[PDB]
Amino acid sequence: ELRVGLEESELWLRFKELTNEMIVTKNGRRMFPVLKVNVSGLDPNAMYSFLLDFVAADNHRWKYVNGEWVPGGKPEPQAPSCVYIHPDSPNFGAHWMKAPVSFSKVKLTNKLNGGGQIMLNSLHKYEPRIHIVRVGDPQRMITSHCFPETQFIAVTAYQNEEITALKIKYN
Numbered sequence: 001e002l003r004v005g006l007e008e009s010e011l012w013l014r015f016k017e018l019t020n021e022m023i024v025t026k027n028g029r030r031m032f033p034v035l036k037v038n039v040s041g042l043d044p045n046a047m048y049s050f051l052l053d054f055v056a057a058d059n060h061r062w063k064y065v066n067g068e069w070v071p072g073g074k075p076e077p078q079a080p081s082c083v084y085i086h087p088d089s090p091n092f093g094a095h096w097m098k099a100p101v102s103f104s105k106v107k108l109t110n111k112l113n114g115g116g117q118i119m120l121n122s123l124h125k126y127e128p129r130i131h132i133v134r135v136g137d138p139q140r141m142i143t144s145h146c147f148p149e150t151q152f153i154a155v156t157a158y159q160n161e162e163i164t165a166l167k168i169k170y171n
Protein backbone atom coordinates (compact mmCIF):
# COMPACT_ATOMS: atom_id res chain seq x y z
CA GLU A 1 0.00 0.00 0.00
CA LEU A 2 1.37 3.53 -0.79
CA ARG A 3 1.91 5.22 2.63
CA VAL A 4 3.17 8.84 3.03
CA GLY A 5 3.92 9.61 6.70
CA LEU A 6 4.75 13.00 8.28
CA GLU A 7 8.20 13.10 9.90
CA GLU A 8 8.65 14.97 13.23
CA SER A 9 4.85 15.00 13.71
CA GLU A 10 5.32 15.77 17.46
CA LEU A 11 7.36 18.91 16.51
CA TRP A 12 4.63 20.08 14.16
CA LEU A 13 2.01 19.37 16.87
CA ARG A 14 3.89 21.67 19.34
CA PHE A 15 3.52 24.51 16.77
CA LYS A 16 -0.07 23.60 15.86
CA GLU A 17 -1.14 23.72 19.55
CA LEU A 18 -0.08 27.48 19.57
CA THR A 19 -1.50 27.99 16.04
CA ASN A 20 1.48 27.76 13.70
CA GLU A 21 2.68 30.89 11.76
CA MET A 22 5.06 31.07 8.73
CA ILE A 23 6.73 34.36 7.71
CA VAL A 24 6.17 35.47 4.06
CA THR A 25 8.63 38.08 2.64
CA LYS A 26 9.16 39.87 -0.68
CA ASN A 27 12.22 37.64 -1.39
CA GLY A 28 10.70 34.47 0.19
CA ARG A 29 11.35 32.67 3.52
CA ARG A 30 12.16 28.98 4.22
CA MET A 31 9.72 27.12 6.52
CA PHE A 32 10.37 25.95 10.08
CA PRO A 33 9.61 23.19 10.76
CA VAL A 34 10.58 21.84 7.30
CA LEU A 35 7.99 19.52 5.73
CA LYS A 36 9.56 16.01 5.61
CA VAL A 37 7.76 12.72 4.78
CA ASN A 38 8.56 9.02 4.73
CA VAL A 39 7.25 7.04 1.76
CA SER A 40 6.56 3.34 1.34
CA GLY A 41 4.73 1.31 -1.36
CA LEU A 42 5.97 3.08 -4.46
CA ASP A 43 7.29 0.84 -7.24
CA PRO A 44 11.05 1.01 -6.49
CA ASN A 45 11.76 0.63 -10.25
CA ALA A 46 9.35 3.40 -11.49
CA MET A 47 10.17 7.14 -11.75
CA TYR A 48 8.14 9.76 -9.91
CA SER A 49 8.19 13.53 -9.32
CA PHE A 50 7.17 15.00 -5.93
CA LEU A 51 5.28 18.33 -5.94
CA LEU A 52 4.17 20.54 -3.03
CA ASP A 53 1.33 23.09 -2.95
CA PHE A 54 -0.61 24.92 -0.17
CA VAL A 55 -4.41 24.67 0.05
CA ALA A 56 -6.35 27.64 1.52
CA ALA A 57 -8.15 26.31 4.65
CA ASP A 58 -10.95 28.97 5.05
CA ASN A 59 -13.46 31.35 3.38
CA HIS A 60 -12.13 34.20 5.64
CA ARG A 61 -8.92 35.69 7.04
CA TRP A 62 -7.63 35.54 10.61
CA LYS A 63 -6.41 38.15 13.11
CA TYR A 64 -4.61 37.86 16.48
CA VAL A 65 -6.68 39.72 19.11
CA ASN A 66 -6.05 39.60 22.89
CA GLY A 67 -3.73 36.53 22.51
CA GLU A 68 -6.19 34.53 20.34
CA TRP A 69 -6.61 33.91 16.64
CA VAL A 70 -10.15 34.87 15.57
CA PRO A 71 -11.92 35.35 12.25
CA GLY A 72 -10.54 38.63 10.83
CA GLY A 73 -12.59 39.47 7.78
CA LYS A 74 -13.45 38.45 4.25
CA PRO A 75 -10.60 36.76 2.38
CA GLU A 76 -8.37 38.17 -0.33
CA PRO A 77 -8.89 36.57 -3.77
CA GLN A 78 -7.04 33.19 -3.88
CA ALA A 79 -3.23 33.23 -4.32
CA PRO A 80 -2.33 31.76 -7.78
CA SER A 81 -1.99 27.88 -7.60
CA CYS A 82 1.87 27.82 -7.21
CA VAL A 83 3.45 24.32 -7.26
CA TYR A 84 6.97 23.58 -5.93
CA ILE A 85 8.78 20.67 -7.66
CA HIS A 86 11.04 18.71 -5.27
CA PRO A 87 14.56 19.25 -6.68
CA ASP A 88 15.30 15.44 -6.71
CA SER A 89 12.49 15.05 -9.35
CA PRO A 90 12.18 12.92 -11.44
CA ASN A 91 13.68 9.96 -9.53
CA PHE A 92 13.22 6.25 -8.83
CA GLY A 93 10.74 4.99 -6.23
CA ALA A 94 13.78 3.50 -4.47
CA HIS A 95 15.27 7.06 -4.18
CA TRP A 96 12.11 8.52 -2.60
CA MET A 97 11.72 5.54 -0.17
CA LYS A 98 15.29 5.11 1.11
CA ALA A 99 15.23 8.26 3.30
CA PRO A 100 12.75 10.96 4.27
CA VAL A 101 11.82 13.41 1.44
CA SER A 102 12.59 16.97 2.69
CA PHE A 103 11.10 20.20 1.27
CA SER A 104 13.81 22.25 3.02
CA LYS A 105 14.36 24.77 0.14
CA VAL A 106 10.74 25.83 -0.64
CA LYS A 107 10.33 29.63 0.04
CA LEU A 108 7.04 31.35 0.99
CA THR A 109 6.49 34.86 -0.40
CA ASN A 110 3.82 37.60 -0.54
CA LYS A 111 5.06 39.01 -3.93
CA LEU A 112 5.06 37.23 -7.34
CA ASN A 113 8.85 38.04 -7.68
CA GLY A 114 9.59 34.58 -9.26
CA GLY A 115 12.36 32.07 -8.32
CA GLY A 116 10.08 28.98 -7.81
CA GLN A 117 8.62 30.67 -4.65
CA ILE A 118 5.07 29.97 -3.26
CA MET A 119 2.85 33.10 -3.06
CA LEU A 120 0.54 33.14 0.00
CA ASN A 121 -1.87 35.80 1.37
CA SER A 122 -0.83 37.15 4.81
CA LEU A 123 -3.36 36.37 7.61
CA HIS A 124 -4.76 33.39 5.67
CA LYS A 125 -4.49 29.75 6.79
CA TYR A 126 -2.89 27.10 4.53
CA GLU A 127 -2.44 23.28 4.61
CA PRO A 128 0.56 21.70 2.82
CA ARG A 129 -0.26 19.02 0.24
CA ILE A 130 2.20 16.69 -1.58
CA HIS A 131 1.53 15.18 -5.03
CA ILE A 132 3.35 12.11 -6.38
CA VAL A 133 3.38 12.13 -10.23
CA ARG A 134 4.39 8.92 -12.10
CA VAL A 135 6.79 9.61 -15.04
CA GLY A 136 5.92 8.38 -18.56
CA ASP A 137 2.36 7.46 -17.54
CA PRO A 138 -0.23 7.84 -20.36
CA GLN A 139 -2.88 8.07 -17.56
CA ARG A 140 -1.00 10.84 -15.83
CA MET A 141 -1.73 9.23 -12.47
CA ILE A 142 -1.23 11.61 -9.52
CA THR A 143 -1.61 10.89 -5.79
CA SER A 144 -2.31 13.71 -3.31
CA HIS A 145 -1.79 13.66 0.50
CA CYS A 146 -2.68 16.45 2.93
CA PHE A 147 -0.90 17.02 6.27
CA PRO A 148 -3.32 18.46 8.86
CA GLU A 149 -0.59 18.69 11.52
CA THR A 150 1.27 21.22 9.33
CA GLN A 151 -1.52 23.88 8.93
CA PHE A 152 -0.27 27.43 9.56
CA ILE A 153 -1.25 31.07 9.12
CA ALA A 154 0.97 33.07 6.69
CA VAL A 155 2.18 36.31 8.40
CA THR A 156 4.52 39.24 7.51
CA ALA A 157 5.67 39.12 11.20
CA TYR A 158 4.96 36.73 14.12
CA GLN A 159 1.83 37.62 16.09
CA ASN A 160 2.10 35.06 18.94
CA GLU A 161 5.26 35.63 21.09
CA GLU A 162 5.03 31.86 22.03
CA ILE A 163 5.59 31.07 18.29
CA THR A 164 8.56 33.51 18.05
CA ALA A 165 10.03 31.70 21.14
CA LEU A 166 9.33 28.13 19.84
CA LYS A 167 10.90 28.93 16.37
CA ILE A 168 14.12 29.84 18.26
CA LYS A 169 13.86 26.98 20.80
CA TYR A 170 13.62 24.17 18.19
CA ASN A 171 15.67 25.78 15.37
Ligand SMILES: NC(=O)N1CCN(c2ccc(F)cc2)CC1
Nearest residue numbers: 007008009010011012014170171
Ligand atom coordinates in the same frame (compact mmCIF):
# COMPACT_ATOMS: atom_id res chain seq x y z
N1 LIG B 1 10.37 17.32 23.01
C1 LIG B 1 9.68 16.76 21.95
O1 LIG B 1 9.16 15.67 22.07
N2 LIG B 1 9.62 17.51 20.77
C2 LIG B 1 10.64 18.57 20.63
C3 LIG B 1 11.71 18.20 19.60
N3 LIG B 1 11.21 17.72 18.37
C4 LIG B 1 12.16 17.72 17.37
C5 LIG B 1 12.26 16.83 16.44
C6 LIG B 1 13.22 16.96 15.48
C7 LIG B 1 14.04 18.02 15.54
F1 LIG B 1 14.92 18.22 14.71
C8 LIG B 1 13.95 18.88 16.46
C9 LIG B 1 13.02 18.76 17.39
C10 LIG B 1 10.47 16.58 18.54
C11 LIG B 1 9.29 16.79 19.51
